[PDB]
């Protein structure tokens, strides 16, 4: 029970469809770069620092560059892809090579500043794990926006004490991680 | 102080060019029923008892029904698909409905007596988790083949202790599960 991933009770339910109607037409809008502003303790994220994720739209799924700084200090480059759950669930499933995929919902996204990412995971056990996360079209984040995100998450009794702010802004070497 | 399936270090080679190549010629005769002889410690797996996977190859991907007992002792079948990993890697990804997707590496099998499979993930904190599996053609696996899967698994230093055998046999409601 020790992690503060690691949650009792079963995934909660998030209302997929409602969002998914919302979303599917407008794929378009969520392309292009997103900075992760915060997230919740994740152990398969590889990318400590000045996280910056471009996603590329082709009708069927989205390819995504993410790049910044690892925890070992260095730049590092990772490839990933997001696509329709396989088996025609009302979901994403983000997808890492040389990882796993996973589900992925959109809580909220208003395409042009913010977006609040969750994906959950049950156990045999009666627990499950959940990964958070908060999108920024910049750098920084507005506070209203912030906000949005902590009630888009209570609502879905995520505690949002668990989100941890990342390192962005004049310390990132943004220009050399778009070269990779 | 942590689990048994956490374990220091990074995820071992295991050869998954050879293996894929040997392998991609044979997924006709992968297919069919295979029962779960033992694995190590999964907290994923939603099946304790009387595991039955059954395989149908479409020339792309396998379609899965799984079915046994669940750890609630009521009858369970859940559906999975097994398909190349979708970056080009030389390995396949399982994938459940309501769950997620991994890598699954098929470590060695004569395909009609037995099965070793291996599914590892590496974490961002110096450590893996891994997940090992013995698979037969029957409820009951001979020590013979037993000892091949065992052997195999030490090549790639995972402790075999970590083992544990499923319930299977004469108890196992089979013709039921078949019907899910």
């Known amino acids: 029970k020790i992690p503060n991933f690691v949650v009792p009770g079963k995934c909660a339910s998030v209302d997929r469809n409602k969002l998914w109607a919302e979303q599917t037409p407008n794929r378009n809008s969520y392309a292009g770069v997103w900075y992760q502003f915060a997230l919740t303790n994740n152990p398969y994220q590889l ?24 925890y070992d200090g260095n730049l590092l480059k990772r490839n990933g892809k ?21 589900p992925l919902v959109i809580l909220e996204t208003d395409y042009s500043n913010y977006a609040c990412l969750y994906s959950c995971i049950d156990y045999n056990f ?20 912030v906000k949005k995100c902590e009630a888009a998450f209570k609502n879905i009794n995520v505690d949002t004490t668990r989100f941890v702010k990342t390192v962005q802004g004049s310390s990132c070497p943004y220009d050399t991680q778009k070269t990779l």
Do not use: M, W
């Open 47 to 70: 990318i400590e620092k000045c996280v910056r994720n471009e996603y590329s739209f082709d009708g069927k799924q989205f390819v995504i560059k993410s790049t910044g700084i690892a």
């Open 82 to 102: 997001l696509y329709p759950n396989p088996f025609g669930e009302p979901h994403l499933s983000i997808d890492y090579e040389n990882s796993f995929a996973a």
């Open 126 to 145: 009666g627990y499950h794990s959940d990964f958070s996360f908060i999108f920024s079209r910049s750098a920084n984040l507005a506070d209203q926006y």
